[PDB]
């Protein structure tokens, strides 16, 4: 049979974080998941004034192969935002996640946050808009938001992925 493909591109991030995603995403998306060789997040995307990397810039440096998720440990932002957790091509091929704003001394919680945000961004790539249900596709702009939504897709979003 056929399966969705997810390529994880490590971009200046620890290997542990990558492995959390490698081991969680296959079952969530019924996907063949591939971890690409690590590289440094591009200096071309560094904004010297903000001292942050731009998410749109990083995303657009990835190869446009559905679905490729860049994962970085560096703080990222996007136009008009103090920071973002990530960015995605809605219905496209590419997304990026930063774990910088997700860090926490609660190691189990950190893992949960990383999976939630990866799942959310990949959901956007698959064409899902933000959702008002108890759903991972709820908008998140703070970690409290992330902690208070579940990791699972609601029945409406799950349907849109599957059919
Ligand atoms: Zn979103
Ligand atoms: Zn939903």
Residue numbers in the entry: -3 to -1, 1 to 160
From the study:
They are distinct from all the other metzincins by their extended active site consensus sequence HEXXHXXGXXHCX4CXMX17CXXC featuring four conserved cysteine residues.
The 6xHis-tag was removed by thrombin yielding the full-length protein with three additional residues preceding the start methionine (referred to as NHis-AfAmzA.). The first three amino acids of the NHis-AfAmzA construct employed in this study are the remainder of the N-terminal 6xHis-tag after thrombin cleavage and will be denoted by negative residue numbers, thus as Gly-3, Ser-2 and His-1. Contrary to substrates, the artificial N-terminal overhang is positioned in a parallel manner to the edge strand ß4 and does not form backbone-backbone interactions with this substrate-fixing element. The crystal structures of NHis-AfAmzA and nat-AfAmzA show rather large differences in the substrate-binding site.
